[PDB]
Write a protein that binds this ligand. Structure first.
Ligand SMILES: Nc1ncnc2c1ncn2[C@@H]1O[C@H](COP(=O)(O)OP(=O)(O)NP(=O)(O)O)[C@@H](O)[C@H]1O
Ligand SMILES: CC(C)C[C@H](NC(=O)[C@@H](O)[C@@H](O)[C@@H](N)CC(N)=O)[C@@H]1Cc2cccc(O)c2C(=O)O1
Ligand SMILES: [Mg+2]
Ligand SMILES: [Mg+2]
Length: 335
């Protein structure tokens, strides 16, 4: 959780106020997680249960959130299974509860996706191919998506707050900042067109979808933005390498297993030219840098535990040394 948001948030106060806008009893709310947003499951007066996501104007505007809502609705209209937004009692997509310190807590609600998180029995090539087909369909569909009013436009990849490392890491980390600057300049040389770049989810991982009768239902579109399609794919790879459901015996071999199955599914649904596969290591490194920023945004750097200092030191060393995120040779996937 963004440290500045944590400094503003009084859960009991906000849930008491939120209870009137969504018709729940605040003592009955179930806390789910507090990673980027504070997320709860609540039950309304009719006995129906929903997912409540709470954040703050420090990190999101209502307008920006409405751009996520627009896109999710478009995907659902075109047959992509996603968790849809639900309205407040006043018919609003996003409710704002004043923060007396300035700004607002921003609240919105979604339908609870059926099914469940993937388990060990699902963690295999069938899932990996299904992820490929689903991602490919999202990309194929997004090619036709138009924003009428630029006020609600989602960000370009390079605008991401957590990549602004110079604002979050101490400035004596000049090597890290050089690595990040060099990499973003490199990525900026890549061709952009409707066939290779568009609005994507940008945080695909197995905490962000349910498997329902063997089908994917995605949620947590909170980071969606304009990216290369290969980056959406690389982010998913980053995430399955980081927290696999079953530990892998070998990182390189697992990378190839995941990617081969994923690509079979993906290419049934959308074109991905072989030339993009060579860029995956660079996008994995960019994600590593983003996570480094996220961790600095979350941690009080004056009160770091031994474990937090060690984690930061590992990322730092990997970034400085240019240690590949995976040892897999991506040229093996080509032709
Ligand atoms: N629509 C939904 N249906 C069912 N469960 C959900 C839904 N949205 C969120 N959850 C659950 O709540 C958790 C947290 O919500 P999520 O939207 O992932 O929050 P976040 O703070 O953006 N997390 P992240 O960005 O992945 O670190 C998810 O991992 C799910 O377990
Ligand atoms: C605390 C945080 C570091 C946790 C991390 N989440 C992410 O890396 C991403 O959600 C963020 O990097 C992303 N929200 C940042 C962004 N700007 O898009 C992790 C990533 C992850 C990978 C695989 C399975 C999972 O369930 C998860 C998960 O739930 O969260
Ligand atoms: Mg999530
Ligand atoms: Mg999220």
């Amino acid at each position: 959780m963004h440290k500045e948001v944590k400094a503003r948030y009084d859960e009991q106060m906000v849930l008491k106020k939120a209870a009137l806008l969504y018709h729940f009893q605040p003592e009955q709310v179930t806390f789910l997680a507090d990673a980027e947003n504070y997320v709860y499951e609540y039950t309304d007066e009719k006995g129906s249960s929903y997912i409540l996501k709470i954040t703050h104007t420090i990190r999101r505007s209502s307008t920006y959130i409405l751009g996520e809502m627009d896109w999710i609705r478009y995907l659902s209209q075109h047959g992509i299974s996603v968790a849809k937004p639900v309205l407040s009692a006043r018919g609003k997509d996003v409710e704002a509860i004043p923060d007396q310190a300035g700004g607002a807590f921003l609240l919105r609600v979604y339908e609870k996706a059926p099914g469940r998180k993937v388990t060990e029995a699902d963690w295999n090539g069938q899932l990996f191919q299904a992820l490929g087909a689903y991602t490919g369909r999202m990309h194929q569909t997004t090619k036709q998506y138009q924003v009428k009013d630029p006020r609600y436009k989602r960000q370009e990849w390079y605008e991401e707050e957590q990549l602004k490392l110079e604002t979050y890491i101490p400035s004596d980390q000049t090597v890290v900042l050089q690595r990040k600057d060099e990499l973003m300049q490199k990525l900026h040389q890549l061709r952009i067109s409707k066939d290779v770049y568009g609005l994507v989810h940008a945080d695909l991982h197995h905490g962000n979808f349910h498997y329902h009768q063997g089908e994917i239902i995605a949620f947590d579109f909170d980071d969606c933005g304009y990216h290369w399609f290969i980056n959406d794919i690389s982010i998913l790879l980053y995430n399955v390498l980081w927290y696999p459901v079953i530990p892998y015996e070998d990182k390189a071999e697992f990378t190839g297993e995941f990617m081969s199955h994923f690509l079979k599914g993906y290419r049934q649904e959308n074109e991905l030219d072989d030339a993009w596969l060579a860029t995956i290591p660079d996008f994995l490194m960019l994600r590593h840098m983003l996570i480094y920023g996220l961790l600095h945004q979350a941690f009080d750097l004056r009160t770091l535990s031994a474990d937090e200092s060690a984690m930061l030191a590992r990322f730092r060393k990997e970034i400085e040394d240019k240690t590949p995120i995976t040892p897999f040779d991506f040229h093996q996937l080509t032709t």
